[model samples]
Target chain A: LSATDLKIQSTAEGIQLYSFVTYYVEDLKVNWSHNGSAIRYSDRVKTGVTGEQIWLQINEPTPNDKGKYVMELFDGKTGHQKTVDLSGQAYDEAYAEFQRLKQAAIAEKNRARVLGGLPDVVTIQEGKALNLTCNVWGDPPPEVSWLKNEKALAQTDHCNLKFEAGRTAYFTINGVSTADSGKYGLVVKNKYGSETSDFTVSVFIPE
Target chain B: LSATDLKIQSTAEGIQLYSFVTYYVEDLKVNWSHNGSAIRYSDRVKTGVTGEQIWLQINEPTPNDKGKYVMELFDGKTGHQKTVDLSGQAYDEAYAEFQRLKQAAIAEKNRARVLGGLPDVVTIQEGKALNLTCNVWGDPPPEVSWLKNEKALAQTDHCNLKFEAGRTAYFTINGVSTADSGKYGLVVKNKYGSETSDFTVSVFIPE
Candidate 1:
């Protein structure tokens, strides 16, 4: 019996489709169909060398063309028929989703820069735990530090700092006073660049 | 003493030699000399924000000028004289020597390939306490591989593959073999493309 075989390998890049025909046939026509529609056919199959591998070049595969494919092989001389089934998935769609997620993560990192509420503004009342938060992102991860006025705040009495890997950092000041009523700053630094946010600290006195 | 105090900080990309002194005074004339002969100085210093701290820009620092530089401080008001001793090593000379050593190592690697010594056509030999060595050069580091014919040899076989932080790599084969005799291929790969050199391996035969 004269027959042919088709093999399909799907990769993240694209799909590799191969065809092999036997029985010493000349002028064999091979065409690919997705679902039921016919694609183009090969011009001619040369003898020897395997007559086995024919490439279906798809640089980027789409979702509609994904799923099951039917390859039809015909003997131009006798009008004989053979059908092979192949399957594929859209790699570009997956890559697009990956890019979307990456952009969202980057946007969140930018939002971290606007923390401490706003410039020269104070929301936390003195004598209350003055809570401050910030965030940043980079290749090697950035370092965050808290500063009172222009000097770096020591992790000492009434001062505490905490950092999260992909999120925010909280700097709490316990038993705050008029001394803490100046500008508070958060500096985030990495190999690429550095950013700073400044906010005023205010004390409320009860009459 | 009518001299402006000049202070500068060093960074990974180096200190801004020109900008640091610009704050002192405008139209400042700086005299630079090598081997006690007056060398030319550009009217203004070009600004650069990257790599290793450098004080006072030397348009081109040569080996002869690798010793000490005396910088005299003077102001038109008082004409005060203060000399700062500046010393710099010629990085270009050191880099040139490195290039020469790298070429010699590469030539030796090519010799190993042509000789077809140890291991067969495509197999890697064990280093038997000796390190297998290879050298490569280009804008970007190239890919180096130990191969037996078409097959790539594994680097985990009691052998050590040592690569310098930026440039070259050495593979230590712990033992020898006829399988390692074939050709050792050095492949230099980058965004542009790749270049390869084939080294033939020769094995010693017993009479």
Candidate 2:
């Protein structure tokens, strides 16, 4: 009799329009059209029919192919048709939004930077206190570490270290002596990048 | 009539086979054959004729298309032909050797490296000499420079500097004082890459 239950969907293959024909007659010819023009089968555009169901698929459909589609069924004496619209309004829009967010997140990532303005070398007399300070900035709050001659240094009475919550680090040595003379480095690092600043200390034995 | 003076050349468009026909009659038909089969005209392959000078071109010829080619001329009663080889041996071999040399040159290039065997921190008594020594290795012989407190330091009576021809740098401050204490950096650079090594010097006043 006539075509009914027309539906359009977006699939991984492409955009598809399907319909079910409710027919009383046994023999019926099914046809598909796009924008009122009859569609021809190709490697990209294909059609299938099984019993009362029929579907048309535009494989990897482009913007030009996203338009009105119709399915028709005829038994020579009578014909029925149904139409649907396929504008790629859902999946494509979601994918475009996803790409925009991904790029924005990439742009927002920051590499650790060691801000200058502090002396990288400190000279003090024996029995005097020595302090080395540096500032750091980074997104996601990079991990901070102190090293002496490229080796990690542990905080103790001899080497008192503290990092402020505001990205400033201080390494202090109280009552400096000959043993306190060495290279002190402030290192800040994150997944994006890392940076290092160097300070040297020499305790002079007062004559 | 017959074809003569057949020549094969590598052109900007692709490989071409051309020949001149010596004819004593009008209405001569020209034909081209590859390997042994007759040739057909298409978008990539073309043939032309302009008064006894005929040519066939294979636009952007691939290895499979490089072989023996023939050009023939027929005046109905008589026929003549000539053959030529389009092996692309000269240009292709030169191109392959050029690519090989380019890759070797790229692989030979070296980034500057500061070999660490000397201490990065030096402490000395007042009136003693402060020596900051560092070794570097790089291809193409990188340039070397010394800096103190992040500023370029020139060699002087107070700031003695010398770099050996073998990539060893020495920054010596004889008779060190309180003002001689600072962060010393050695920087080496070339076209390929660059590196920096830090040294801290402290002259303590001996009691």
Point to the candidate with the largest lDDT. 2
Candidate 2 per-residue lDDT, tens place, B1-207, comes to 656677665554566667876655577787788889888789899999877778987776667776778877778887777877766664475345545655555644566766532344556667654444466778777788888899998999887888787477766665678898888788998777788877677666888
> Relative to the true structure, how large is the alpha-carbon lDDT of every model?
0.47, 0.70
Report the C-alpha displacement of residue A62, candidate 1, in angstroms: 16
lDDT, candidate 1, A1-207, per-residue tens:
255455554433444455555556656676666567765433321112246444454433445445455555556545544444443233444445445655565555544342222223443334544444454455556777888879988776667777787446666666566676777777877654577876665666535
Looking at candidate 2 chain B, the ten consecutive residues that score lowest on lDDT are B115-124
TM-score for the first chain in candidate 2 comes to 0.48
Model 1 complex DockQ against the native: 0.00
lDDT of 1 by residue, B1-207 (tens): 243332232222222232233235444444534446565546432333222211455433234434444344345554433233234333444435445655565554433221111111222122212223234454444455555466676777654555564345554444444444555665555443445555454344334
User: Candidate 1: which stretches are off by over 4 Å?
Assistant: A1-120, A123-125, B1-207
- The DockQ-based CAPRI class assigned to model 1 is incorrect
- Model 2 residue A65 distance off true place after TM-score fit, in angstroms: 99
